[PDB]
Write a protein that binds this ligand. Structure first.
Ligand SMILES: [Cl-]
Ligand SMILES: [Cl-]
Ligand SMILES: [K+]
Ligand SMILES: [Mg+2]
Ligand SMILES: [Mg+2]
Ligand SMILES: [Mg+2]
Ligand SMILES: [Mg+2]
Ligand SMILES: [Mg+2]
Ligand SMILES: [Mg+2]
Ligand SMILES: [Mg+2]
Ligand SMILES: [Mg+2]
Ligand SMILES: [Mg+2]
Ligand SMILES: [Mg+2]
Ligand code: NA
Ligand code: NA
Ligand code: NA
Ligand code: NA
Ligand code: NA
Ligand code: NA
Ligand code: NA
Ligand code: NA
Ligand code: NA
Ligand code: NA
Ligand code: NA
Ligand code: NA
Ligand code: NA
Lengths: 56, 194, 65, 46, 81, 119
RNA sequence: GCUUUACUGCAGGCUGUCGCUGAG
RNA sequence: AUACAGGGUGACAACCCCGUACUCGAGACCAGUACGACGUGCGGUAGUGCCAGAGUAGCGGGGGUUGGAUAUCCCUCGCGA
RNA sequence: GCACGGAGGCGAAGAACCAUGGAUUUCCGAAUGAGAAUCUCUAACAAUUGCUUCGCGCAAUGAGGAACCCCGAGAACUGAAACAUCUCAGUAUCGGGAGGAACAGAAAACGCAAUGUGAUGUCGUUAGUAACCGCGAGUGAACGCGAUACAGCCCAAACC
């Protein structure tokens, strides 16, 4: 089976959803954790120093 | 004449001698059956506490903390590293055990602030320290002229910033002269080389 | 406009509440007429009805009811 | 699929945000809805 | 405080329910239960509500289909507004 | 318990606590482990009281030997609050010292004997 | 990337010692 | 013109308009600081071995860190005034 | 309101507009009664603490913030024309947290050795000096001095 086009058909599962906290469509409804703000994992908001250049 | 306290002090100079020697063998059994952080009504070292700033007052708390002995509980590298950094067993943390204790005790009491601390012995694998913590919100402390300084907003979470007793000592801040070049006024400001 | 602040404070706690429920009904009937594509509108009012109501509520709080 | 009461609400908003700039605004501004979304060509969130 | 009734839902189909079945359709706040819609309706139009069917609309509001007792007349109650 | 080397029968203790109350009214008494320590050192102590429910025991551990090398007599009390109450305090008391009895120099002296005999 | 009696180190296993640790 | 800074105005504007110099007013910070005042009482002589912070000072095993070399600062295991 | 349409309205009962103060301020959110993709289920400081009338009665914490600050964890490419110590560098990045600034701070100091200096930051200089280093490549202070600003105190104990 092609990993390409034919394997794309079975994709009707829902994972990432509108986030109650941040409003971004990153709330993984299966993990109940947001990949964008970290809602469901961290009380504090997900944030990293590498989201920008070292000296900025 | 000698203060009664002077005798407690005197017995803790050689904790493995005389009566205190037998007390420890006693307690340490009940101690190993207690939690990591246990609040206690009275300091086991009264001269020690009082000497550190303890009072028999409302808003003052003391607690015993158990921490493991030894070096760092460090995971081995999962990626590239030069031999110098492939180290695991001989790596020890840069923050002494007394200081971990003070912290674990502080977190257990979110509203309290660490005043000071002292060791109360250790066995083969624990290390115990009793920590003195003050309620900066309780009047009686807010109204005490020798403690109210800890109430100031600028003191929020002292331990976590190394403003504690053992915090500053561990920070290499003891000497005011030779040897404290990269220590004072702060490690971080000195490029962290101390 | 047709209902001033003085006049509102010259009411008794009960008059304000009487007046409030009055405005609410005028407004509700305004929205029904609007909901029926009704043209006999006069837009300056359905807007005045909202502000009036807000004044009445505002005074009620100030006066203690 | 089975939608919730919240979900239904947003889909509703989106359908509304999918209208065109009223003819009177053209006149009033002396002269484009950049958020026009087609059900087939585009994809909403959730 | 939010009010239960928002305004009457007048459409062709709302007319037929009215003329043919003595029903009044309203645009209510979605947090309102069939109970709250019933009472609010009776108190506002001084009528007897027999039944209340509701639907959360693709418009973001909640529609309510209220039937009045044979004793009241929908066509009339709606005519005065 | 580690500083306690002999058991004081309930009754003896009562006469002791009784003797203590008349002392505070008729004679002199020191309340508190520090003051009491200063009595034994200074020699102005005649009979010293030591509670047995003191925790941490460090607070009293020294009384015994200190007392013996100062010839001063001492008696054990079970409850810390009783010795407090008996001393006239609203709080408890780890130790107390009868600095010159009062209208009990007799009873007192004999308690000191009774204990000396209690080994 | 892989291999080994290539070079240098690291975990881990075995073993002596010290602490926990006491009586005859 | 104590005003020839800058802008606007149907084209190059000190004098068309805003403003600009001059003078004046207000809020904020300085700061619950400086000054002032209230209370407290500083200091000196002689005598007195009454008091003055311990797993510390110090040594040893192993690391880290530093310019710190024997002579940086720190951790950990043992010993210890 | 941006926003110059249409209709209609508000302003001398002084609107617009601006300043200060006040009212209102849905739901989710540290999110705190419980569960949930912003909704639902049947009184709530959930959790961890302090005081405690031992009743959540009175309080604290939690999250955010442009960077700055403090305490911990800590690479590799790279340089050495290879490369291991060394270097990049306590850098990137990670964990915990403070404030409007942090941190430091009134000597068990300095040691131009003196009949001298006199808390601490920071700035200039001392100096690419002293010191380190497959003594290779590289790394690298301090005292003092000239300045800025200045400020000196509280316990523990003895004796009560
Ligand atoms: Cl703290
Ligand atoms: Cl000098
Ligand atoms: K390297
Ligand atoms: Mg593939
Ligand atoms: Mg700084
Ligand atoms: Mg449509
Ligand atoms: Mg239904
Ligand atoms: Mg290095
Ligand atoms: Mg909840
Ligand atoms: Mg190279
Ligand atoms: Mg070379
Ligand atoms: Mg370097
Ligand atoms: Mg120097
Ligand atoms: Na705390
Ligand atoms: Na260092
Ligand atoms: Na689509
Ligand atoms: Na509507
Ligand atoms: Na390969
Ligand atoms: Na060592
Ligand atoms: Na508001
Ligand atoms: Na709270
Ligand atoms: Na409570
Ligand atoms: Na090269
Ligand atoms: Na190479
Ligand atoms: Na080297
Ligand atoms: Na000079």
């Amino acid at each position: 089976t092609g990993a390409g086009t034919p394997s794309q058909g079975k994709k009707n599962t829902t994972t990432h959803t509108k986030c109650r906290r941040c409003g971004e469509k990153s709330y993984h409804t299966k993990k109940k954790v947001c990949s964008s703000c970290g809602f469901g994992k961290s009380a504090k908001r997900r944030d990293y120093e590498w989201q920008s250049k070292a000296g900025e | 004449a000698r203060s009664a306290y002077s005798y407690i002090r005197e017995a803790w100079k050689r904790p493995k001698e005389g009566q205190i020697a037998e007390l420890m063998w006693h307690r340490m059994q009940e101690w190993r059956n207690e939690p990591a952080v246990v609040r206690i009504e009275r300091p086991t070292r009264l001269d020690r506490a009082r000497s550190l700033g303890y009072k028999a007052k409302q808003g003052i708390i003391v607690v015993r903390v158990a921490i493991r002995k030894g070096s760092s509980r460090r995971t081995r590298f999962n990626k590239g590293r030069r031999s110098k950094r492939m180290m695991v067993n001989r790596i020890t943390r840069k923050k002494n055990i007394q200081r971990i204790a003070e912290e674990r005790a502080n977190r257990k009491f979110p509203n309290l602030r660490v005043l000071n601390s002292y060791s109360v012995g250790e066995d083969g694998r624990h290390k115990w320290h009793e920590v003195i913590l003050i309620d900066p919100d309780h009047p009686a402390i807010k109204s005490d002229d020798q403690l109210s300084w800890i109430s100031r907003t600028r003191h929020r979470l002292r331990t976590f910033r190394g403003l504690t007793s053992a915090g500053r000592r561990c920070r290499g801040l003891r000497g005011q002269g030779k040897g404290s070049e990269k220590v004072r006024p702060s490690l971080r400001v000195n490029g962290a080389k101390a | 406009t047709v209902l001033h602040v003085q006049e509102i404070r010259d009411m008794t706690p009960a008059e304000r509440e009487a007046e409030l429920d009055d405005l609410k009904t005028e407004l509700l009937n305004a929205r029904a007429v609007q909901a029926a594509g009704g043209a006999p509108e006069n837009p300056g009012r359905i807007k005045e009805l909202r502000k009036a109501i807000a004044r009445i509520k505002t005074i009620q709080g100030e006066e203690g009811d | 699929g089975k939608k919730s009461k919240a979900t239904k609400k947003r889909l509703a908003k989106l359908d509304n945000q999918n209208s065109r700039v009223p003819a009177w605004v053209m006149l009033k501004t002396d002269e484009r809805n950049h958020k026009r979304r087609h059900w087939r060509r585009n994809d909403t969130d959730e | 405080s939010w009010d239960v009734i928002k305004h009457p839902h007048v459409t062709e189909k709302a007319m037929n329910d009215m003329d043919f079945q003595n029903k009044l359709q309203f645009a209510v706040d979605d947090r309102a239960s069939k109970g709250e819609v019933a009472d609010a309706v009776e108190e506002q139009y001084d009528v007897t509500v027999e039944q209340v069917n509701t639907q959360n609309t693709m418009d973001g509001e909640k529609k309510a289909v209220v039937r009045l007792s044979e004793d009241d007349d929908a066509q009339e109650v709606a005519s005065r507004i | 318990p580690v500083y306690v080397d002999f058991d004081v029968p309930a009754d003896l203790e009562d006469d002791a606590l009784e003797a203590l109350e008349v002392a505070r009214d008729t004679g002199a008494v020191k309340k508190g482990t520090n003051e009491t320590t200063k009595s034994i050192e200074r020699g102005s102590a005649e009979l010293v009281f030591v509670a047995e429910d003191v925790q941490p025991e460090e607070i009293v551990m020294h009384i015994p030997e200190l007392a013996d090398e100062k010839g001063v007599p001492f008696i054990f009390v079970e409850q810390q609050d009783d010795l407090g109450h008996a001393a006239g305090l609203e709080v408890g008391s780890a130790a107390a010292a009868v600095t010159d009895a009062g209208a009990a120099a007799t009873v007192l002296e004999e308690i000191a004997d009774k204990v000396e005999e209690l080994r």
